Amino acid sequence: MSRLIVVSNRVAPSAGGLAVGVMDALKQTGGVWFGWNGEIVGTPDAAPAVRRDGNVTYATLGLTRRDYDQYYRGFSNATLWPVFHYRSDLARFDRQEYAGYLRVNAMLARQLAALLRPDDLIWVHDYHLLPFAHCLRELGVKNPIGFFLHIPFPSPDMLRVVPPHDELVKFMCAYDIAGFQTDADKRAFSDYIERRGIGTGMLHAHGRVVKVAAYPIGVYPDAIAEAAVQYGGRKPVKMLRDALGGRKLVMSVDRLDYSKGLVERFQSFERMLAGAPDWQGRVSFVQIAPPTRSDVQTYQRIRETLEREAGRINGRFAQLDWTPIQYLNRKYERNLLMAFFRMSQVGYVTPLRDGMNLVAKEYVASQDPADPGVLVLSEFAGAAAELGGALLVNPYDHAQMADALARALAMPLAERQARHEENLAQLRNNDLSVWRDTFVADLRSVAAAASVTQRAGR
Amino acid sequence: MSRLIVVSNRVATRPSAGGLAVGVMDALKQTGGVWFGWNGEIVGTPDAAPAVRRDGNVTYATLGLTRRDYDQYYRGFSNATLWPVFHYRSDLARFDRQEYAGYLRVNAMLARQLAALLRPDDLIWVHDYHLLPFAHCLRELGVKNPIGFFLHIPFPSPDMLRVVPPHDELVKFMCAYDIAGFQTDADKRAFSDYIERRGIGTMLHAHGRVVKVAAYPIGVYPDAIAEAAVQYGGRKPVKMLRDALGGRKLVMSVDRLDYSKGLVERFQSFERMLAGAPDWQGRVSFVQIAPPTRSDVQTYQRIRETLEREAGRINGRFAQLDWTPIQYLNRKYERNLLMAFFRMSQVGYVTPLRDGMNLVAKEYVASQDPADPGVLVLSEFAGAAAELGGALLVNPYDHAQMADALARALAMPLAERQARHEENLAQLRNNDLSVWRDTFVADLRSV
Amino acid sequence: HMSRLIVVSNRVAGGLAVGVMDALKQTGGVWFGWNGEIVGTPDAAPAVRRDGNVTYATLGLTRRDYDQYYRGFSNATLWPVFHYRSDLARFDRQEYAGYLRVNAMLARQLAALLRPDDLIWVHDYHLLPFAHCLRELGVKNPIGFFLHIPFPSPDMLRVVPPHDELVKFMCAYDIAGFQTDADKRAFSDYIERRGIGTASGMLHAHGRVVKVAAYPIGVYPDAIAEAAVQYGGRKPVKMLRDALGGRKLVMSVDRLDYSKGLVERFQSFERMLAGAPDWQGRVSFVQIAPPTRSDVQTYQRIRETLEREAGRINGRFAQLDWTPIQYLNRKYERNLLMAFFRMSQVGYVTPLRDGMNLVAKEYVASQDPADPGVLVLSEFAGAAAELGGALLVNPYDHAQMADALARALAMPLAERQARHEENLAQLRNNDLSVWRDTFVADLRSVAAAASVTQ
Amino acid sequence: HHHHHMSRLIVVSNRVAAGEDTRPSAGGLAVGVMDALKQTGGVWFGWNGEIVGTPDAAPAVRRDGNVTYATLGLTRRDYDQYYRGFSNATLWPVFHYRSDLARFDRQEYAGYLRVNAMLARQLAALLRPDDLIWVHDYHLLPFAHCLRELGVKNPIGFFLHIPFPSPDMLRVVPPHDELVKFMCAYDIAGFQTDADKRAFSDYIERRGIGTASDDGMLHAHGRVVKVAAYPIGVYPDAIAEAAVQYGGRKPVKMLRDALGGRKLVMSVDRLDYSKGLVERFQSFERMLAGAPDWQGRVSFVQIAPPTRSDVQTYQRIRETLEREAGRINGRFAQLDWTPIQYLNRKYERNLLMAFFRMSQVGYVTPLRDGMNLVAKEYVASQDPADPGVLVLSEFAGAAAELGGALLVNPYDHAQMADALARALAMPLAERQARHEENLAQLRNNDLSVWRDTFVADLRSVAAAASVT
Ligand SMILES: O=c1ccn([C@@H]2O[C@H](COP(=O)(O)OP(=O)(O)O)[C@@H](O)[C@H]2O)c(=O)[nH]1
Ligand SMILES: O=c1ccn([C@@H]2O[C@H](COP(=O)(O)OP(=O)(O)O)[C@@H](O)[C@H]2O)c(=O)[nH]1
Ligand SMILES: O=c1ccn([C@@H]2O[C@H](COP(=O)(O)OP(=O)(O)O)[C@@H](O)[C@H]2O)c(=O)[nH]1
Ligand SMILES: O=c1ccn([C@@H]2O[C@H](COP(=O)(O)OP(=O)(O)O)[C@@H](O)[C@H]2O)c(=O)[nH]1
Ligand SMILES: [Mg+2]
Ligand SMILES: [Mg+2]
């Protein structure tokens, strides 16, 4: 078989992440996983480090401080990330950072080209690598190259906040396949090309033909359930169950990102306690929130605001034996988290914007079907398009969020089971295999032809 | 001929000032029409009836609002939810259910007062985001008259509008109008996109009604502005600026101190130019006229504090003993004085982050001397950017591009400056304020 | 033939009541001040109710009166400066004039109730001008003043622009009483070193003679201990006991004031947990901090800063069954607090400046002598001058505070008993009776001295 | 000729002047000490301002004629703990009565001690038995103690340029007792003012550490210390000549032409929170609000170069001041009038003198200042035929000497605004009476008195004290 070449920013089953999504395809084809090893080095690396683990080969590379600052911390995380989440107020464009972004893409692309074989299928992942296919084409690479964006793709009126948006869209048309999480994301990309006169489910633009499609990432719901049962007796689980002592449990797990709406989430739980005082002392909200991107200033500000809200809300409602919001910056093993979800009565997942959000899907998959919890889900998560059994909320409406918490906490068993079974059927109908197998098959349908009109499958 | 009924948040009167009055007065004068709305005053108890004053041929019907009305209608939902979201600032949005209910209550209270004054054939023209529910309230009172709406600010695309929690109800309210008018095509498509892509409707057919959806970009009177700029060129404030500039080039800005206007990005870009081209230090002056706005809204206090700090930091960095780099003034000036400032300047610097149209951009072009015209540096997120192809268009999130555009504007040769001004001037004469007024009134007479 | 005691204070009913009531009962005296109600128009005369032997003469205030008594000069200039916070002082001339005007209005209302031999006892910084206002109405009675908060040294006092007029006002009192010796010497230093007057412990200044003295306020330690036992079985006490589940308890009770050093306190406990990780999950810090002066911008700033620190620290160290800092904005009945103190192993009292701090004294008095807790106390509290059994700390040194917490938590029974008996003997040697009896006796000596040629 | 006639003066300070900064027209410690260094063939020892990647083995020794400069670099860790940390984040705020800005850290204090000991070890190898050692300012409180532990028996004098706070404030510094103990290792502890030396004596007497006796000598920590005040002055007649000589330089003409007849209020300050710049700006605003006829007729020029930018407290006060400049100018500016001309650039000191002379008012209102020489420099720059008015904070040490100044409490904005208006309206005769009174003070305590008096004490105290 042709090798599958996976390219992502950071090269790695219990831990989720990209590895569990792509590993079987790498193992099947004897493929390669190429990318950055997370290290900073003082001088650029001459060649990639090649480690072979059975059938899969790992090719990693270091980055300089200047690379890290301009490619990752800068343009990716201070321009693309805030804009793609509809936060133009947090965007900071810098010309030298953007040039560093392009330079790193080219450096990575030339390093990969030296490892390529003519029949390799190339699968590039996420916003760090928008230019990667374009860079490969300029090196003469004719292989099929597919792209998958894990985060939202903003509508044109928001994308334009990124100053090189036009060049970025041209770069994306170097991919034979541009995959997105949801239909809305793909429509945003198509709307940009059509409504700006750039081109006309195939897109014809910038002298190429592009397949534009949605491949919403799912999970392995049956494995998650087994893991949640297997870990139900670990010490952290007994610790939390002893602490609740019969109180109902609202559970959240989020990177401490401004995309996750943690402040709105905290204030809405406060609003529910004030409006339904009989809940005071009878429910506990646990928020596990490991820090992320601490070296980006926007993340320091959102973290300080959340800490103040935790202190203010807890000072307002705490009793001598009750902390209303248990806020923890510690990271927990993924299997423990599933057992936390199963124990809980409510999953509270209210991002202001999210490509998909797997926590929402993992929350449903952890539940006991005989006594399942309720998912309260922001309508701005990509997962809202599938999880119809969730209570959908608008996170800018704190009163609506508070009512949904109260409804979730008091919901009779029968409706909890109906909503859970509806959501569970969705997870089984679109598990992680569908994302992998469908994208891999679409890549296998592209021909490595010189005529642009011959590449496309059908 | 049926009289035109103008409905807006504030009721004005002279043509030397701008505002809605200059846009609607001649149609009110032509039709013997009525201007209905709030008199700007706050009352302790709600008024039973509107105050009716007739100034020649036009009738003014005014009413006061209570403190609670003010807090929830004007300060609340309108200015704390609609204004930030419609300007793509989801971080500044604060939705409150009680404020939104008060927004609806005030609209209905105004609507019940208007219905008692109406005639069966009156043409009703409603203006701007404070009054999205107004047509709906009138239909529920049995009003069958033609009712048109014109939105002065942008209409956000569906992914941004959804930040407003009662977004579906508001779009339903907008379909009560026979005409949904917007500044630009992009605004009209965002409204169409919501209805079509959410399966509400299919002219638009939605909520059991038929709605004409169109764009009517507001213009100006470029020949009148040019004349005023010449007539006021010798007023004392104009001489003060001229003598003080003393050969330095002049960059002019006039903006409400709104977070929509990009004042911080604008200041930092001028700093960036001075840092990158040190020869300009002492040779150019940036005048920013920025009267305060909505001072009782906390988000407006924060942007003001941030802008004052930047003025102090930047002037402290580059000022010399006879040179203040950025002259920052919180004063309001007579509109005719502004035209004389615009004409005197070499660059108009108008870089909003989001703006429904921006008439300052159009007024700036119209003031210039065609024998020696200034250059317009204009943000691509202003509605005016769709018409003023002669401007140097910039993305305000790119400080380097803004600084390069300023430097390019300040040095642009006469021949290229004249070509750009003539391109923009022709557009202004093609779509002057008459076109906006006559076309909306003509469409209303067709309902 | 016993003269009435007239008590003048902010509000007429622990607290000030327990300190002065026995003297009011003994003399058939009067307590004068504000009744807690607001009026649309000024009250003509005070409302006079007689409760057995004590008369309560109370007055309403208008919104303008209330504003310039509490909100203005007293709390925006005097309070921050006397607590060494020159950065928080906001002097305003009209506020200061309103401060004098309100004192004069209260004084004119009180003068009409006075008998020529009444003994007048004025309390705290809202009422510095009160004696002056009375003298200008012709009042010759003995008038004593007691300042409950610190008196700053002349270099800090001068931050208050009318510092000279205010000290002249204090010399209208026959007695200027302070919490500690350092406070009275700061007042003496201003008068002596600025050439205003001379000593002879009597001060001769502004043509008057003023007795300058310290009267440190105490408690009733034996009453506090009995109350702690009597309330040891209430539901809130059992709630806390059960929730601790063997964990050690560090207790704090403070108004949310910037003088209380709450931010430094939280960070020192954070530093202690960081440097001694085995304490994580084995000790809990309870901070009861009811809000105070919430409509004042300076107090909102410290409150926001403290909440953020609570959230940051708990986020750093909490476990799924352990909240490191239990921060509560609730107020508790005073008798419940004594039971909380008694249950705890450490009392944590770290003001950056405090006139006395009675919580520190209440904490010690609550303890079981068979198993007593340890007091960790800032040396900038007035109580530090008496409570030598405490672990004294400088709150600007977080490491010292963290070390003292650790030492308090591990201290053997013998040393805890030695330190506790030292603090208890002090409390019994200077209980609240001493403050009352000494000041009243001094007031009776001004009146006696007037009966005889000096 | 094997023998040296005069004992060398060894000046020890945090920063040793080099290059342009040795010139008399620059100011600083150099103009205070150079004549004694030249007279005695002395040495100036201390840090060269540089950061080195590894500690220096020995000092760099440069000779300028008769004077030797012996300097050393500091490591980043040394700099962070000695200079940025304990000196500038603990001592400086506390000694200026800002307990709210003070931040103690044990590791920083240890590095402060370590750096003092390292510097003392390097100096000890250069000393001769009769050298007179003159140590300067709060960075070096421990220096004499470290030298005594190396066996140094020389006369060592200390002069504090900043205030010494009273005991209730000094105690905010956690190692206060140790630091006072260290200060008693000096044969002389010199201060700016009587209030400063009394605060030091108050600490020792009221804490039972020692007693005062035999006229001005303190007996504490087993030593005898002369405690005295030596208020620093200026060269008023040299300042006058510089102000006239530079009256035609381009920056001066630029300012003159831009004012165009408007009155000029002049301030020069490092951007320190001790200098009261926010209160100063807001009081000028209050004057403009209360006296609108002044709008457009007077300009406030504030030259405020940045200082200690890597200390967070300095970043915050700067941000607050920038916001105030922007807000006040937005409120009152006209199209040809900037009310507050706020400049962060540094100017040649002689240019500053020509600015002071041109102005009508010197506006010098620190919340706390050891002395403040700008206030004295302002007086000296004036033309006696038409002199400007000094508006001066009572919390500057110079307030005790400049009796012709208008004294203000900067915590009272209304008084400061009134003083500005009073200064702007003052008739010539009273301006001259006040100016001549201040000028005579400057001439009768010029910079020579500070130097000759301290050097005289160094030449005699330790020896006179050895008499039984
Ligand atoms: O302490 C944590 C936090 C998160 N996760 C995992 O990290 C992923 C988070 O992905 P999601 O789509 O929810 O959001 P993202 O973090 O990618 O924005 C999920 O698989 C979580 O199970 C985890 O294992 N431990
Ligand atoms: O001191 C001022 C400030 C503004 N304007 C006028 O206010 C309008 C500003 O409208 P624009 O469309 O530019 O933006 P908006 O202020 O309506 O958001 C223009 O007609 C300006 O001439 C004025 O006359 N004087
Ligand atoms: O919720 C509370 C808080 C405080 N106190 C009491 O209030 C006093 C606190 O006074 P302290 O002298 O300690 O400081 P102050 O608050 O007067 O500055 C003590 O008697 C406490 O027991 C109380 O009864 N309940
Ligand atoms: O830009 C400036 C600022 C200050 N100075 C000089 O620096 C000293 C300031 O000392 P002062 O005692 O007034 O205060 P300090 O800065 O020492 O605290 C004076 O000699 C001023 O002439 C200077 O030459 N240029
Ligand atoms: Mg105990
Ligand atoms: Mg002068």
Q: Provide the token pair at B445.
A: 């007479």
- Ligand sitting nearest the alpha carbon of C83: 3
Integer Cα distance of B160 and B155 in angstroms? 9
DSSP labels for D242-288?
A: HHHHTTTSHHHHHHHHHHTT-EEEEEE--S-GGG-HHHHHHHHHHHH
Among A127, A337, A361, A366, say which to mutate for ligand 1: greatest number of ligand atoms within 8 Å of CB.
Answer: A337
Residue A171 half-sphere exposure toward CB, CA atoms < 13 A: 21
Which run of H or of E encompasses A159? helix A156-159
Integer Cα distance of B63 and B47 in angstroms? 7
Atom of ligand 1 nearest to the CA of A332: 1
Residue D423 near residue D387, CB atoms below 8 Å? no
With H, G, I as helix, E, B as strand and everything else as coil, classify residue B154: coil
Which run of H or of E encompasses C82? helix C79-82
**Is there contact between A and B if contact means ≥3 C-beta pairs under 8 Å?**
yes
Q: Which residues of D touch B308 (CB under 8 A)?
A: 322-327, 330
* Inter-chain touch B165–A400, beta carbons under 8 Å: yes
Integer Cα distance of B214 and B180 in angstroms? 7
Strand-pairing partners, residue B8, are: B37
Smallest CA-to-CA distance from C362 within C385, C337, C393 is with C337
Ligand 2 atom 5: the closest Cα is on which residue? B335
Which CATH superfamily is B1-221+431-447 part of? Glycogen Phosphorylase B; (3.40.50.2000)
In the block, residue with structure tokens 């999205």: B132
Side by side, which strands form the sheet with D298-303? D340-343, D298-303, D263-268, D361-364, D389-393, D406-408
**Residue C189 among the catalytic residues:** no
Strand-pairing partners, residue D15, are: D47
Residue D329 near residue B311, CB atoms below 8 Å? yes
Cβ of D239 closer than 6 Å to ligand 4, yes or no, is no
Give whole-number Cα distances, D310 to A40, D75, D83, D84, D313, in Å: 26, 16, 11, 8, 9
Give whole-number Cα distances, C43 to B180, C40, C46, C59, C60, in Å: 61, 9, 7, 7, 6
Integer Cα distance of C246 and C94 in angstroms? 57
Q: Provide the token pair at C168.
A: 């002249």
Integer Cα distance of D217 and A8 in angstroms? 76
With H, G, I as helix, E, B as strand and everything else as coil, classify residue B58: strand
State the catalytic residues of B.
152, 355
Residue C263, exposed/middle/buried by CB under 10 A (0-12, 13-18, 19+)?
middle
Residue C449 near residue C33, CB atoms below 8 Å? no
Structure solved using which method?
Answer: X-ray
Q: Which residues of A touch B163 (CB under 8 A)?
A: 394, 396
- Spacing, Cα D226 to ligand 4 middle (Å): 29
Known binding residue A170? Answer is: no
Integer Cα distance of C278 and B64 in angstroms? 67
**For residue D28, is it left (φ>0), alpha (ψ between -120 and 50) or beta?**
left
Cα D132–chain centre separation: 23
Smallest CA-to-CA distance from B51 within B42, B61, B41 is with B61
Phi, psi of A3 (to 5 degrees): -70, 145
Strand-pairing partners, residue D224, are: D219
Beta strands B51-55 and B58-65, pairing class: antiparallel
The 10 Å Cβ neighbour count of residue B91 is 16
End-to-end CA distance of chain B: 14
Cα A324–chain centre separation: 29
Residue B109 near residue B46, CB atoms below 8 Å? yes
Domain range D1-235+445-463, CATH architecture: 3-Layer(aba) Sandwich (3.40)
Residue C297: which residues within 8 A CB-CB, separation 6 or more? none
Integer Cα distance of B110 and B117 in angstroms? 11
Which run of H or of E encompasses B393? strand B392-394
Ligand 1 atom 17: the closest Cα is on which residue? A357
Q: Which residues of C touch A329 (CB under 8 A)?
A: 315-316
- Ligand sitting nearest the alpha carbon of A360: 1
Residue A53, exposed/middle/buried by CB under 10 A (0-12, 13-18, 19+)?
exposed
Residue D235 near residue D452, CB atoms below 8 Å? no
Residue C240 near residue C231, CB atoms below 8 Å? no
The 10 Å Cβ neighbour count of residue D50 is 12
Residue C227: which residues within 8 A CB-CB, separation 6 or more? C334, C335, C338, C339
Q: What residues does ligand 2 touch, defined as CB less than 6 Å away? A: B 18, 254, 256, 289, 291, 332-333, 335, 338, 357-360, 363
The CATH class of the B222-430 domain is alpha beta
Domain range D236-444, CATH architecture: 3-Layer(aba) Sandwich (3.40)
Integer Cα distance of C402 and C348 in angstroms? 11
Continuous H helices in B61-155: 67-69, 83-86, 97-115, 134-140
CA distance B148 to chain D (A): 41
Residue D122 near residue D59, CB atoms below 8 Å? yes
In the block, residue with structure tokens 């921060």: C327
DSSP state of C30: E
Residue B81 half-sphere exposure toward CB, CA atoms < 13 A: 28
Smallest CA-to-CA distance from B151 within B140, B165, B161 is with B161
Smallest CA-to-CA distance from D422 within D397, D391, D393 is with D391
Phi, psi of C15 (to 5 degrees): 95, -170
Q: Taking an 8 Å Cβ-Cβ cutoff, which residues of chain C contact chain D?
A: 84-89, 91, 93, 152-156, 158-161, 182, 186, 352, 379-380, 394, 396-400
* Inter-chain touch C304–A309, beta carbons under 8 Å: no
Phi, psi of D365 (to 5 degrees): -130, 55
The 10 Å Cβ neighbour count of residue A42 is 7
Which value, to the nearest 10 degrees, does the dihedral of the CA atoms of residues C139, C141, C146, C152 take?
Answer: 50
**Residue D369 among the catalytic residues:** yes
With H, G, I as helix, E, B as strand and everything else as coil, classify residue A169: helix
Strand-pairing partners, residue C248, are: C283
Known binding residue B140? Answer is: no
Integer Cα distance of B179 and B421 in angstroms? 34
* Inter-chain touch D343–B312, beta carbons under 8 Å: no
* Inter-chain touch B240–D336, beta carbons under 8 Å: yes
- Ligand sitting nearest the alpha carbon of B220: 2
Ligand 3 atom 17: the closest Cα is on which residue? C357
Known binding residue B394? Answer is: no
Residue D156 near residue D135, CB atoms below 8 Å? yes
Q: Provide the token pair at A49.
A: 């480090």
Same fold, B1-221+431-447 and B222-430: yes
Known binding residue B261? Answer is: yes
Mutate to test the interface with B, among A90, A95, A186, A396 (most CBs of B within 10 A): A396
Ligand 3 atom 15: the closest Cα is on which residue? C357
> C413-425 burial by CB neighbour count: b if 16+ within 10 A, else e?
eeebbebbeebbe
Beta strands D223-229 and D217-220, pairing class: antiparallel
Known binding residue D299? Answer is: no
Residue C198, exposed/middle/buried by CB under 10 A (0-12, 13-18, 19+)?
exposed
* Inter-chain touch B321–D327, beta carbons under 8 Å: no
Among D159, D274, D302, D373, say which to mutate for ligand 4: greatest number of ligand atoms within 8 Å of CB.
Answer: D373
Tell me, which fold does domain C1-220+430-448 have in CATH?
Answer: Rossmann fold (3.40.50)
Phi, psi of B210 (to 5 degrees): -120, 130
Residue B426: which residues within 8 A CB-CB, separation 6 or more? none
Integer Cα distance of B178 and B192 in angstroms? 15
Which value, to the nearest 10 degrees, does the dihedral of the CA atoms of residues D172, D174, D180, D181 take?
Answer: 160
Residue D244 near residue D339, CB atoms below 8 Å? no
**At CA C359, angle to CA C357 and CA C360, rounded to 5?**
75
Residue C183 near residue C141, CB atoms below 8 Å? no
CA distance B95 to chain A (A): 6
Integer Cα distance of D184 and D145 in angstroms? 8
Residue A139 near residue A112, CB atoms below 8 Å? no
| Residues after which a C–N gap over 2.5 Å breaks chain B | 12, 202
Smallest CA-to-CA distance from A287 within A322, A256, A251, A255 is with A251
Which run of H or of E encompasses C108? helix C93-111
Q: Which residues of A touch B398 (CB under 8 A)?
A: 93, 95, 163
Residue D145: which residues within 8 A CB-CB, separation 6 or more? D181, D182, D185
Smallest CA-to-CA distance from C378 within C366, C358, C362, C360 is with C360
**At CA C346, angle to CA C340 and CA C351, rounded to 5?**
95
Integer Cα distance of B193 and B199 in angstroms? 10
> D93-132 burial by CB neighbour count: b if 16+ within 10 A, else e?
bbbbbbbbbbebbeebbebbbbbbbbbbebbeebbeeebb
Task: Tell me which amino acid residue B410 is.
Answer: L
Side by side, which strands form the sheet with C283-288? C325-328, C283-288, C248-253, C346-349, C374-378, C391-393
Smallest CA-to-CA distance from B125 within B31, B242, B13 is with B31
Integer Cα distance of D219 and B164 in angstroms? 77
Cα D392–chain centre separation: 16
> C87-102 burial by CB neighbour count: b if 16+ within 10 A, else e?
ebbebbeebbebbbbb
Strand-pairing partners, residue D290, are: none
Residue B149 near residue B176, CB atoms below 8 Å? no
Integer Cα distance of D379 and D390 in angstroms? 7
* Inter-chain touch B165–A397, beta carbons under 8 Å: yes
Integer Cα distance of B328 and B308 in angstroms? 9
In the block, residue with structure tokens 């949310």: C256
Ligand 2 atom 16: the closest Cα is on which residue? B256
- Ligand sitting nearest the alpha carbon of C14: 3
Mutate to test the interface with B, among D303, D335, D345, D347 (most CBs of B within 10 A): D335
Smallest CA-to-CA distance from C96 within C78, C73, C130, C74 is with C73
From the list B97, B157, B399, the residue facing A399 with the nearest CB is: B97
Cα A410–chain centre separation: 31
Integer Cα distance of C284 and C262 in angstroms? 16
Q: Provide the token pair at D168.
A: 């209730």
Residue C238: which residues within 8 A CB-CB, separation 6 or more? none
Cα B148–chain centre separation: 19
Cβ of D148 closer than 6 Å to ligand 4, yes or no, is no
In the block, residue with structure tokens 């200041």: B267
Integer Cα distance of A294 and A314 in angstroms? 25
Residue C340: which residues within 8 A CB-CB, separation 6 or more? C237, C240, C251, C253, C286, C288, C332
Give whole-number Cα distances, A425 to A94, A337, A360, A374, A387, in Å: 46, 22, 14, 15, 10
In the block, residue with structure tokens 């999953």: A347
**At CA B338, angle to CA B335 and CA B343, rounded to 5?**
135
Which run of H or of E encompasses C310? helix C297-317
Give whole-number Cα distances, A229 to A226, A247, A341, C154, in Å: 5, 21, 11, 71
With H, G, I as helix, E, B as strand and everything else as coil, classify residue D380: helix
| Residues after which a C–N gap over 2.5 Å breaks chain A | 12, 200
3-state secondary structure B112-135: HHHHCCCCCCCEEEEECHHHCCHH
Beta strands B4-10 and A391-393, pairing class: unpaired
**Is there contact between B and D if contact means ≥3 C-beta pairs under 8 Å?**
yes
With H, G, I as helix, E, B as strand and everything else as coil, classify residue B216: coil
Catalytic residue among D78, D131, D196, D369: D369
From the list B309, B316, B329, the residue facing D342 with the nearest CB is: B316
DSSP state of C277: G
DSSP state of C40: S
The CATH class of the C221-429 domain is alpha beta
- Spacing, Cα C4 to ligand 3 middle (Å): 29
DSSP state of D46: E
Residue C259 near residue C298, CB atoms below 8 Å? no
In the block, residue with structure tokens 């004696």: C131
Give whole-number Cα distances, B366 to B216, B229, B343, B371, D309, in Å: 20, 9, 8, 13, 47
Q: What does chain D come to in residues?
A: 468
Catalytic residue among C43, C148, C163, C204: C148
Task: Tell me which amino acid residue A295 is.
Answer: D
Beta strands C374-378 and C346-349, pairing class: parallel
Q: Provide the token pair at B14.
A: 């002279």
Strands (DSSP E) along C314-417, which ranges?
325-328, 346-349, 374-378, 391-393
Give whole-number Cα distances, A99 to A66, A187, C151, in Å: 11, 28, 63
Known binding residue B379? Answer is: no
Task: Tell me which amino acid residue C160 is.
Answer: V
Give whole-number Cα distances, C453 to C445, C448, C449, C450, in Å: 14, 11, 8, 8
Task: Tell me which amino acid residue C308 is.
Answer: R
CA distance A236 to chain C (A): 7
Domain locations in chain B as residue ranges: 1-221+431-447, 222-430
Known binding residue A76? Answer is: no
> A307-331 burial by CB neighbour count: b if 16+ within 10 A, else e?
bbbbbbbbbbbbbbbbbbbbbbbee
Q: Provide the token pair at D201.
A: 């004596």
Q: Which chains touch B (3 or more CB pairs under 8 A)?
A: A, D
Q: Provide the token pair at D361.
A: 């008012």
Cα A278–chain centre separation: 37
